[PDB]
Design a protein around this ligand. Sequence first.
Ligand SMILES: [K+]
Ligand SMILES: [Mn+2]
Ligand SMILES: [Mn+2]
Ligand SMILES: [Mn+2]
Ligand SMILES: [Mn+2]
Length: 135
Amino acid sequence: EEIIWESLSVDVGSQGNPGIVEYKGVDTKTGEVLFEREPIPIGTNNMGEFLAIVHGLRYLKERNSRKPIYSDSQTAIKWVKDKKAKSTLVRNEETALIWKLVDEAEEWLNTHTYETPILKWQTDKWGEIKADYGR
RNA sequence: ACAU
DNA sequence: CGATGT
Ligand SMILES: [K+]
Ligand SMILES: [Mn+2]
Ligand SMILES: [Mn+2]
Ligand SMILES: [Mn+2]
Ligand SMILES: [Mn+2]
């Protein structure tokens, strides 16, 4: 209904899907970039969206912030809620790195607590999420 | 059909 | 046009 401007917005960017994956988090109110992941050689859009939310959870918890997180990915929001990323990406030598990051994110979710609301950014009403890569 |  | 997901 209404944008919660006091929030963190996260998004994936990619070159190919599957392909090179990165993500970033920004202050929804100002667009200031708060964190950026170094590009990962092979992953999927949804894996990256998942890692971006989990990194946001860790970022906010470390600084004792109760702000919500916006994501535009229905899939990734559900995976975080389930603490399980149900990706179809083959597990092989080429995909080992992204799968290590995903498994490690799930492990974090299963060993830590948080109250952070994870909210759907309503692209159809509000335009692109402020962490979008412009591609 | 919806979300990327 | 193709791919990732519920
Ligand atoms: K979008
Ligand atoms: Mn997105
Ligand atoms: Mn796993
Ligand atoms: Mn985007
Ligand atoms: Mn895009």
